[PDB]
RNA sequence: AAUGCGCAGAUACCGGGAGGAACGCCGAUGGCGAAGGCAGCCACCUGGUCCACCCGUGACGCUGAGGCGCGAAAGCGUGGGGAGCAAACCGGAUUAGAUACCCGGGUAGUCCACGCCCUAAACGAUGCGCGCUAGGUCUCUGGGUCUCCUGGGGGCCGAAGCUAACGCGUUAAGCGCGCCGCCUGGGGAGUACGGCCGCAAGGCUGAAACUCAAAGGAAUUGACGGGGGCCCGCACAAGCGGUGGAGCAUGU
């Protein structure tokens, strides 16, 4: 059980240090602005650690959010 | 009943209307196991209803019992401090048991001297929608749906 | 007396009460209700029924402004948070949408001892 | 529940602003450091470390009494700050009482600078270095001909062996060499005295008289638990009659 789709699979090629590729970094956050776990991102220890540092830079630039409202219920 | 689920014991049908519900009512009326004196009272009531109402007696009984069945009741339960009357549906089995019991109880509260008269007038008052038996039912229902602020404790 | 038609329903749920606030399309409240506004004094206020009542009360006081549709917004986790939502879905008031916006710190103020327990 | 707060309009909601403290998700299933300890992001300054090449020096090594530096929290001094939290303290409630647990408030403090204090269940309760002794598996990080292999680190299971047992087992509690620190029954006592250190609080060093036949470690069988799981009995619930009142019988 708990079988979703991996974020890495859906993407093709991309630089984990590009803190401006919103269109692609967005794919790494939840319905909420939270940074997806590794079970969802499919990244590796090392990569996930860089992604995190990148998503955070874009957030400071106002390109990515810190948190969004959950719509549903 | 910690082991078995307990099975309802069907009873011998009526020796007149043949209705099994009728026998049940007679058992409630029965005390000290004097079944004869018991039945001799219930049937004596059916006679008292035939002159009071043009309608047959069994039609009245059915109606009465039905009016007296409670849809909901409260059952105490400790949840973390004091006791809490939690409202909840009443199973068909219980609705029947209570109706009949209450009927016989209110019945013996009436002033009329003859027993049969008490059951008769009480059944009639019940089908009419009046009578202290129907009150208990009303008061019990009024009891729950008066504690809806705890109905989320199903139990 | 301003015929607003559509607005926002705010459900503030907590383990002690549920308070609902109906507002106009841009935040300003029109009418509100709560577990206490409906008679429940003690802790009955936290009960889910109190929520259901508080919501219904809120909606009715809103219809008085010709309110038809509204966007729900929940904050809190307490009981009755869900009844409050359902109540509004049965109050003729069209629930345009439901959104959870409970405020959560990015670790700031040291919580009360009560809310720290094992951290 | 009450204290408390609110019609000098609170709570809930929207907008704006001030301020202090902390830093969600990522986060661990982890990482770094000698320890204490260290996680928003950016820049600067700076320490350690691992790998490959096996190029240079050529035994330059190991350990380390004393010395010196570092050293969580609380605490101290001077000055600053002060959202939230909160010893004391002020109230509410609970209770046989309640100098507590629960609730409403709240000062020091928590934060910063500089100076001090030097303690801890400062724990892996396991000084440092080196060599030697099956493997399996997960993982962090580097190299490689990238099934799988090779180095460093983190976990787990386990050969030999060890161990009172529990357990340890290439991250040894194994087999060995080197050097340091420490123990030598319990209570009295981390106390007294002395000395040294500290503004203080106190720290370090550390007895004696007297007194006990134990103090103690692991494991075993029970019993027990306001520990857990499963399950019974008129055990509760459901129900019908009754005892408790009366008179009397009878036992005490
Ligand atoms: Mg006024
Ligand atoms: Mg406020
Ligand atoms: Mg505001
Ligand atoms: Mg200020
Ligand atoms: Mg280390
Ligand atoms: Mg630590
Ligand atoms: Mg460096
Ligand atoms: Mg060479
Ligand atoms: Mg040479
Ligand atoms: Mg040395
Ligand atoms: Mg030397
Ligand atoms: Mg210190
Ligand atoms: Mg301090
Ligand atoms: Mg100070
Ligand atoms: Mg000060
Ligand atoms: Mg000040
Ligand atoms: Mg407080
Ligand atoms: Mg307090
Ligand atoms: Mg300081
Ligand atoms: Mg020690
Ligand atoms: Mg590789
Ligand atoms: Mg290893
Ligand atoms: Mg580790
Ligand atoms: Mg062995
Ligand atoms: Mg052994
Ligand atoms: Mg082992
Ligand atoms: Mg060794
Ligand atoms: Mg040993
Ligand atoms: Mg010593
Ligand atoms: Mg001694
Ligand atoms: Mg001491
Ligand atoms: Mg001394
Ligand atoms: Mg001095
Ligand atoms: Mg001695
Ligand atoms: Mg022992
Ligand atoms: Mg039996
Ligand atoms: Mg019983
Ligand atoms: Mg009874
Ligand atoms: Mg007696
Ligand atoms: Mg006696």
UniProtKB/Swiss-Prot annotation, chain A:
Q: Which GO terms describe its biological process?
A: translation
Provide the alphabetized UniProt keywords: Ribonucleoprotein, Ribosomal protein, RNA-binding, rRNA-binding
Intrachain disulfide bonds:
none
Superkingdom, according to UniProt?
A: Bacteria
User: What are the annotated GO cellular component locations?
Assistant: ribonucleoprotein complex; ribosome
GO MF: small ribosomal subunit rRNA binding; structural constituent of ribosome
- Asked whether the UniProt record includes Hydrolase among its keywords, one would answer no
Q: Family membership, please give it.
A: Belongs to the bacterial ribosomal protein bS18 family.
The UniProt subunit note reads as follows: Part of the 30S ribosomal subunit. Forms a tight heterodimer with protein bS6.
Function, as annotated, reads: Binds as a heterodimer with protein bS6 to the central domain of the 16S rRNA, where it helps stabilize the platform of the 30S subunit.
Spell out the protein name for this chain: Small ribosomal subunit protein bS18
From Swiss-Prot, chain B:
Keyword tRNA-binding, does the record have it? yes
- UniProt xrefs under Pfam families: Ribosomal_S7 (PF00177)
> What GO terms fall under cellular component here?
small ribosomal subunit
Keywords attached to this Swiss-Prot or TrEMBL record, sorted alphabetically, are: Ribonucleoprotein, Ribosomal protein, RNA-binding, rRNA-binding, tRNA-binding
Q: Which GO terms describe its biological process?
A: translation
Q: Which InterPro entries match?
A: Ribosomal_uS7, Ribosomal_uS7_bac/org-type, Ribosomal_uS7_CS, Ribosomal_uS7_dom, Ribosomal_uS7_dom_sf
Tell me the superkingdom of the source. Answer: Bacteria
SUPFAM superfamilies linked: Ribosomal protein S7
Query: GO MF annotations for this entry?
Result: rRNA binding; structural constituent of ribosome; tRNA binding
What does the subunit section of this Swiss-Prot or TrEMBL entry state? Part of the 30S ribosomal subunit. Contacts proteins S9 and S11. Binds to the C-terminus of IF3 and to the C-terminus of Era.
Q: What does this protein do?
A: One of the primary rRNA binding proteins, it binds directly to 3'-end of the 16S rRNA where it nucleates assembly of the head domain of the 30S subunit. Is located at the subunit interface close to the decoding center. Binds mRNA and the E site tRNA blocking its exit path in the ribosome. This blockage implies that this section of the ribosome must be able to move to release the deacetylated tRNA.
What family is reported?
Belongs to the universal ribosomal protein uS7 family.
Protein name, UniProt field: Small ribosomal subunit protein uS7
Species:
Thermus thermophilus (strain ATCC 27634 / DSM 579 / HB8)
UniProtKB/Swiss-Prot annotation, chain C:
Task: Give GO terms: molecular function aspect only.
Answer: rRNA binding; structural constituent of ribosome
One Gene Ontology cellular component term attached to this UniProt record is: ribonucleoprotein complex
Task: Keyword check for DNA damage, yes or no.
Answer: no
Stretches the record annotates as Disordered: 99-119
The cross-references to SUPFAM superfamilies, in alphabetical order and at most eight, read:
Translational machinery components
Q: Name one Pfam family in it.
A: Ribosomal_S11
GO terms in the biological process aspect are: translation
Compositional bias ranges of the Basic residues kind? 109-119
**Which keywords does this chain's UniProt record carry?**
Ribonucleoprotein, Ribosomal protein, RNA-binding, rRNA-binding
InterPro entries attached to this UniProt entry: Ribosomal_uS11, Ribosomal_uS11_bac-type, Ribosomal_uS11_CS, Ribosomal_uS11_sf
Key word rRNA processing present:
no
Function recorded in the entry: Located on the upper part of the platform of the 30S subunit, where it bridges several disparate RNA helices of the 16S rRNA. Forms part of the Shine-Dalgarno cleft in the 70S ribosome, where it interacts both with the Shine-Dalgarno helix and mRNA.
Q: What is the protein's quaternary organization?
A: Part of the 30S ribosomal subunit. Interacts with proteins S7 and S18. Binds to the C-terminus of IF-3; however exactly how IF-3 interacts with the 30S subunit is unclear. May contact the C-terminus of Era.
Give the record's family classification. Answer: Belongs to the universal ribosomal protein uS11 family.
PANTHER family, A to Z: 40S RIBOSOMAL PROTEIN S14/30S RIBOSOMAL PROTEIN S11
Name the chain's protein. Small ribosomal subunit protein uS11
Q: What is the lineage of its organism?
A: Bacteria, Thermotogati, Deinococcota, Deinococci, Thermales
């Amino acid at each position: 059980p708990s079988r979703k789709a991996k974020v890495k699979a859906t993407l093709g090629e991309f630089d984990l240090r590009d803190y401006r590729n919103v269109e692609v970094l967005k794919r790494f956050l939840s319905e909420t602005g939270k940074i997806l776990p590794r079970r969802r991102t499919g990244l590796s220890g090392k990569e996930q650690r860089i992604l995190a540092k990148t998503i955070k830079r874009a957030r400071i630039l106002g390109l990515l959010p810190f948190t969004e409202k959950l719509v549903r219920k | 009943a910690r082991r078995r689920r307990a099975e309802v014991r069907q009873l011998q049908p009526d020796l007149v209307y043949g209705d099994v519900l009728v026998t049940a009512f007679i058992n409630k009326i029965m005390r000290d196991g004097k079944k004869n004196l018991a039945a001799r009272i219930f049937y004596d009531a059916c006679k008292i209803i035939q002159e009071k109402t043009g309608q047959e007696p069994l039609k009245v009984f059915k109606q009465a019992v039905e009016n007296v069945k409670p849809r909901m009741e409260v059952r105490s339960r400790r949840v973390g401090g004091a006791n809490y009357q939690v409202p909840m549906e009443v199973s068909p089995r219980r609705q029947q048991s209570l109706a009949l019991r209450w009927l016989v109880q209110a019945a013996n509260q009436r002033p009329e001297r003859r027993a049969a008269v008490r059951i008769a007038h009480e059944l009639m008052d019940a089908a009419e929608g009046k009578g202290g038996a129907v009150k208990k039912k009303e008061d019990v229902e009024r009891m729950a749906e008066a504690n809806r602020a705890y109905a989320h404790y199903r139990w | 007396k301003r015929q607003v038609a559509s607005g926002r329903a705010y459900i503030h749920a907590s383990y002690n009460n549920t308070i609902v606030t109906i507002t106009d399309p841009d935040g300003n409240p029109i009418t509100w209700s709560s577990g206490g506004v409906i008679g429940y004094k003690g802790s009955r206020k936290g009960t889910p029924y109190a929520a259901q009542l508080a919501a219904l009360d809120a909606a009715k006081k809103a219809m008085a402004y010709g309110m038809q549709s509204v966007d729900v917004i929940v904050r809190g986790t307490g009981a009755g948070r869900e009844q409050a939502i359902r109540a509004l879905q049965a109050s003729g008031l069209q629930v345009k949408s439901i959104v959870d916006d409970t405020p959560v710190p990015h670790n700031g103020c040291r919580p009360k001892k009560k809310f720290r327990k094992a951290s």
